[PDB]
Amino acid sequence: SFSGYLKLTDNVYIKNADIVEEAKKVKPTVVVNAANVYLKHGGGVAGALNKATNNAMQVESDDYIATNGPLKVGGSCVLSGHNLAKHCLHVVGPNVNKGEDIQLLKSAYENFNQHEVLLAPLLSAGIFGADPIHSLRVCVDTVRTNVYLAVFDKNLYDKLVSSF
Ligand SMILES: CO[C@]1(C(=O)O)CCN(C(=O)c2ncnc3[nH]ccc23)C1
Fold first, then answer.
1. How crowded is residue 113: how many other Cβ atoms within 10 Å of its Cβ?
2. Nearest Cα to 126, choosing from 147, 152, 99?
3. What is the residue extent of each domain of the chain?
4. Which ranges carry the Macro domain?
5. Which amino acid residue places its CA nearest to atom 17 of ligand 1?
6. 3-state secondary structure of 35
7. 152 CA → ligand 1 middle, Å
8. The domain at 6-161 falls in which architecture?
9. Are 80 and 97 in contact (CB under 8 A)?
10. Which residues pair with 34 in a beta bridge?
11. Ligand 1 atom 11: the closest Cα is on which residue?
12. In whole angstroms, what separates CA 127 from the centre of its chain?
């Protein structure tokens, strides 16, 4: 089970951890990937998760896109979790650095409500350009299922907890 998490609300927990190492240790039912609409896992959390799967996540993702076309910003798909989890929920938050609408962040977090418990990063944070404090606020105000947030950056983790 999940261990070492601080409790923020009735259903949201948080830890300063590398989500790849956390997924390998816990092997959760669902790990969330911070995806783009093309499922091109080059960098950020997506690049790190994909590298941990030895590129099997990218091979599966390219077959999914060839069949179905791109996801919508705010949308998601369920694929295999490979060696990290039973399933991977690929969720597309808006990328502010690409000029996407931050209002779609709530729609992105609504995908989490389809799963009873998830290991997840903060959506639209990091290289997606949104304020992580805002992303945590939208997460707590949207997700009703049990979410275990992994924040890689120690200094950001301390700021998120102290300003919550
Ligand atoms: C909330 O801000 C971030 C964090 O500290 O968790 C900043 C970075 N973020 C990531 O998900 C991330 N970005 C690049 N490489 C990574 N390797 C593993 C995770 C990851 C989100």
1. 13
2. 152
3. 6-161
4. 1-164
5. 45
6. coil
7. 5
8. 3-Layer(aba) Sandwich (3.40)
9. no
10. 91
11. 45
12. 13
